[PDB]
Amino acid sequence: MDIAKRCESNPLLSPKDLKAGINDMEITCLLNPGVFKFKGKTWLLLRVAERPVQQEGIISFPIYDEQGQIKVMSFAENDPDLDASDPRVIGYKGKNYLTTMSYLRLVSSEDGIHFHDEPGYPPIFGKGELEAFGIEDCRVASTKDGFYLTFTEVSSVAVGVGMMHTNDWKTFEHYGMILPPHNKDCALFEEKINDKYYTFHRPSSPELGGNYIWLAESPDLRHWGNHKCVATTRDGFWDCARVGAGAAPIKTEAGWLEIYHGADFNHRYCLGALLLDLNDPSKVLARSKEPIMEPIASYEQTGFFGNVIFTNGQLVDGDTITIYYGASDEVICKAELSVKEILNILN
Amino acid sequence: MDIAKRCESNPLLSPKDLKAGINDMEITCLLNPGVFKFKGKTWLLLRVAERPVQQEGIISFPIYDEQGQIKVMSFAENDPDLDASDPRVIGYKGKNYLTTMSYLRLVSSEDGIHFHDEPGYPPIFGKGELEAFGIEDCRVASTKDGFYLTFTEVSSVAVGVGMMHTNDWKTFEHYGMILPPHNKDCALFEEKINDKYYTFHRPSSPELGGNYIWLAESPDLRHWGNHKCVATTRDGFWDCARVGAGAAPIKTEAGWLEIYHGADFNHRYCLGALLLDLNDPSKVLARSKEPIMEPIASYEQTGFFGNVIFTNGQLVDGDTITIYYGASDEVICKAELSVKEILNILN
Ligand SMILES: OC[C@H]1O[C@@H](O[C@H]2[C@@H](O)[C@H](O)[C@@H](CO)O[C@@H]2O)[C@@H](O)[C@@H](O)[C@@H]1O
Numbered sequence: 001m002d003i004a005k006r007c008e009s010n011p012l013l014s015p016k017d018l019k020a021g022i023n024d025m026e027i028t029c030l031l032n033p034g035v036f037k038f039k040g041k042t043w044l045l046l047r048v049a050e051r052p053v054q055q056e057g058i059i060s061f062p063i064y065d066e067q068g069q070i071k072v073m074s075f076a077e078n079d080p081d082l083d084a085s086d087p088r089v090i091g092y093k094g095k096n097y098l099t100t101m102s103y104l105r106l107v108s109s110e111d112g113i114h115f116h117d118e119p120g121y122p123p124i125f126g127k128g129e130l131e132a133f134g135i136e137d138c139r140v141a142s143t144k145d146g147f148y149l150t151f152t153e154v155s156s157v158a159v160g161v162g163m164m165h166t167n168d169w170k171t172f173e174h175y176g177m178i179l180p181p182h183n184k185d186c187a188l189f190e191e192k193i194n195d196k197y198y199t200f201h202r203p204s205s206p207e208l209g210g211n212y213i214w215l216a217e218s219p220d221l222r223h224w225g226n227h228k229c230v231a232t233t234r235d236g237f238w239d240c241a242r243v244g245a246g247a248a249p250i251k252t253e254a255g256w257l258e259i260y261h262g263a264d265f266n267h268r269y270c271l272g273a274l275l276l277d278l279n280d281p282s283k284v285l286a287r288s289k290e291p292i293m294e295p296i297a298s299y300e301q302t303g304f305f306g307n308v309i310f311t312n313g314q315l316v317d318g319d320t321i322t323i324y325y326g327a328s329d330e331v332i333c334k335a336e337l338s339v340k341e342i343l344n345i346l347n
Numbered sequence: 348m349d350i351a352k353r354c355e356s357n358p359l360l361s362p363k364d365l366k367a368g369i370n371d372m373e374i375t376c377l378l379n380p381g382v383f384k385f386k387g388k389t390w391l392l393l394r395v396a397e398r399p400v401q402q403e404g405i406i407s408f409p410i411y412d413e414q415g416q417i418k419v420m421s422f423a424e425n426d427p428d429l430d431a432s433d434p435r436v437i438g439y440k441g442k443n444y445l446t447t448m449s450y451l452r453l454v455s456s457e458d459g460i461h462f463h464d465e466p467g468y469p470p471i472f473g474k475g476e477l478e479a480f481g482i483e484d485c486r487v488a489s490t491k492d493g494f495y496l497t498f499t500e501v502s503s504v505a506v507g508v509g510m511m512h513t514n515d516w517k518t519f520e521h522y523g524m525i526l527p528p529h530n531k532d533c534a535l536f537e538e539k540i541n542d543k544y545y546t547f548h549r550p551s552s553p554e555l556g557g558n559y560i561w562l563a564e565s566p567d568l569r570h571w572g573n574h575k576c577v578a579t580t581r582d583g584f585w586d587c588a589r590v591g592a593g594a595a596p597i598k599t600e601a602g603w604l605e606i607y608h609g610a611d612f613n614h615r616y617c618l619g620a621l622l623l624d625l626n627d628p629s630k631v632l633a634r635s636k637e638p639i640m641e642p643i644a645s646y647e648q649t650g651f652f653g654n655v656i657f658t659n660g661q662l663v664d665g666d667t668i669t670i671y672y673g674a675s676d677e678v679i680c681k682a683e684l685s686v687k688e689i690l691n692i693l694n
């Protein structure tokens with residue numbers, strides 16, 4: 001059922017391949033990159049998760065303090081008030097915490113396989129209360145007016161969506177939190193429709209709902225409204241627990257092709273396909289019954305919870321969709337897909 | 348600690364005082380009314396919860412189907428897949444449902460104590476997928492351009508916020524779902540600030556957050572953004588479980604006075620006070636340590652879970668704040684408060 005062609009060099013990047021960005025921290029995970037072209041080079045906007053060296057029987061992680069300087073929180077694994085069932089997000093006396101801090105980092109490549117840092121292009125770190133626990137999973141939308149970044153803003157009070165804009169990838173303009181908690185997986189459409197901007201997003205309901213893919217429209221790109229539920233999870237299927245959009249949708253004659261991701265209760269992530277109407281993106285035309293890509297490879301099965309494929313960035317060259325994705329929330333990888341082949345399955 | 352003066356006629360309205368709006372349904376609850384003045388009369392925009400006559404050993408409730416016609420869902424009380432611990436919201440095989448369906452209903456009054464229906468002013472029922480489980484808790488904002496309604500839109504996929512507009516309360520314009528799930532308690536500001544519209548709202552986070560009061564800004568009132576966390580819950584306090592805004596804030600010399608509501612883990616709701624900066628409503632100036640109103644009265648303690656005070660509508664006449672509120676999610680009530688007295692406590 002997997003119709004994906006991995007690059008033979010996978011994994012491309014690993015934690016040990018790069019030097020740490022935060023002082024006195026190791027790199028734990030490289031995952032979930034945004035993808036775009038600039039200066040001829042192919043660029044990756046990596047999510048880089050860092051934390052201190054872990055001592056035996058102690059969970060330690062960085063957080064910004066009141067002064068705004070990074071500090072190390074520590075909890076004992078055998079503490080009764082600690083809940084560390086999920087290694088990504090932990091609880092302690094009600095309040096929640098991340099076990100790492102993420103930031104966005106640029107890497108360029110001529111060939112599109114060997115990536116390295118570029119002098120003069122420093123990383124993007126979290127700023128303000130709402131980005132106190134870091135920023136994650138950035139989608140890059142290449143448009144006429146420039147590059148728009150839509151990413152997760154994490155803090156003790158919210159998992160929400162922020163947006164930035166850049167032309168040269170050196171100066172940045174921050175539009176703030178565009179969608180409130182609990183929301184992520186924001187894929188901005190790369191062109192306007194009926195003189196309006198559109199984006200997918202993925203709010204999470206404690207009750208009376210779930211983790212479904214939603215649509216929103218905007219005139220100025222800062223303010224959003226007229227929300228509509230696009231596609232939900234499916235009981236019994238591979239995408240029963242949660243669904244979410246990846247990168248921006250691809251413009252085709254059939255409709256808007258969207259490579260979304262879905263997972264089950266074992267936290268096994270796969271990729272699927274959504275086809276949507278051109279005039280009304282909220283209306284679904286076709287949807288893949290089975291996943292178009294699964295965590296088959298060995299490096300896609302080296303997780304600490306489940307087997308994870310996650311894409312939030314891709315390039316399109318006619319029929320060939322070049323996707324970059326995180327494998328087991330640890331390493332960066334590359335693969336290729338066929339538009340025609342996907343559309344064929346959706347008939 | 349209660350600084351509130353109840354009307355002696357409380358309760359004003361009860362389920363049995365009105366005739367049912369939906370066919371073959373009883374009125375279960377009258378609660379949480381919006382308040383405004385029109386045609387000299389004082390108007391209440393009641394939330395009216397209805398369901399069939401309950402048979403022994405069966406929970407039955409109405410929902411709109413795809414066509415938009417009423418249907419009766421039924422569950423057996425002794426079913427192992429049923430969870431009816433909470434009588435308001437139930438679960439069945441993962442999916443959640445309400446035990447009643449709410450709609451909005453207009454009642455006028457000369458004196459402001461005896462309320463009755465007005466011919467030519469029919470009720471507002473839910474329309475579309477997102478209002479399939481009904482609409483609830485409407486705040487009415489009286490503005491220069493007319494009356495703006497902000498209410499909860501409930502369905503199987505979302506608890507969200509919709510907005511409508513009216514001049515005569517006969518014609519209506521629907522702006523759709525302005526804020527995505529899981530969100531409610533939307534209090535639109537009755538005037539602009541720095542040529543921008545502002546509203547409180549209350550998103551709910553499954554993790555990494557809670558039930559806090561938030562702020563959002565808008566240019567056109569349909570699209571919202573630049574979200575900011577205003578005030579959270581307080582561990583140990585009466586408002587440890589959840590907080591939420593009521594009606595629109597009152598313009599004073601000190602700042603924006605907001606009569607918010609808060610509850611504990613026993614689901615005991617009280618009312619408090621927030622004072623906010625005029626230029627920056629997100630910045631809190633003062634907040635009441637103890638509640639300004641509590642469920643003291645007998646009719647405020649006839650619940651089926653806890654003691655509930657809930658306001659989402661009020662009138663202001665100089666110093667006197669006339670609030671209308673739901674008691675035990677069953678009956679409508681009235682009370683009076685002093686601006687000066689509240690401001691005095693916040694010093
Ligand atoms: O772990 C798979 C998948 O999970 C989601 O994010 C997790 C984690 O990375 C994130 O820090 C927290 C808080 O936002 O949420 C989840 O635990 C995805 O959004 C993606 O990041 C990740 O690959």
Ligand SMILES: OC[C@H]1O[C@@H](O[C@H]2[C@@H](O)[C@H](O)[C@@H](CO)O[C@@H]2O)[C@@H](O)[C@@H](O)[C@@H]1O
Pocket residue numbers: 378379435436445483484499501506531655657673676
């Ligand atoms: O019951 C107290 C208080 O709770 C909140 O609403 C509940 C219920 O009335 C509502 O139908 C569902 C779905 O929105 O949510 C809550 O269970 C308040 O918003 C208010 O309506 C109610 O008085």
